[PDB]
């Protein structure tokens, strides 16, 4: 949770076999005003997420 500079047309690009595009959903390379920053873990083999 930060103060990002979002795009007009955001998308993502997969990492298993990357596509022709470039994952460009923001450009805020200013280590901006991040109010929250966290990392949690989950099972890779579990089918559903909630």
């Amino acid at each position: 949770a930060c103060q990002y500079t979002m795009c007009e047309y955001p998308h993502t690009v997969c990492k298993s076999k990357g596509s022709i595009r470039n994952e460009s959903w923001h450009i805020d390379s200013s280590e901006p005003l991040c109010l929250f920053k966290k990392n949690f873990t989950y099972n890779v083999s579990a089918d559903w997420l909630y």
Binding site: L33, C34, L35, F36, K37
Partner: protein, 49 residues
């Protein structure tokens, strides 16, 4: 200044002084009160409780 994450202390002890058998004050994770502690063997807490 006055915005962000890297705050200073402002806080109390966090003392490992759990004194059972007597009556104490407590401010545990936000909840305040007075009570008597007593140690016991339990397993129903999970890793987010």
């Amino acid at each position: 200044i006055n915005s962000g994450t890297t705050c200073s202390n402002d806080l109390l002890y966090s003392n490992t002084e759990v004194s059972t058998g007597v009556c104490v004050n407590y401010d545990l994770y936000g909840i305040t009160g007075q009570g008597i502690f007593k140690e016991v063997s339990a397993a129903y807490y999970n890793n987010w409780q």
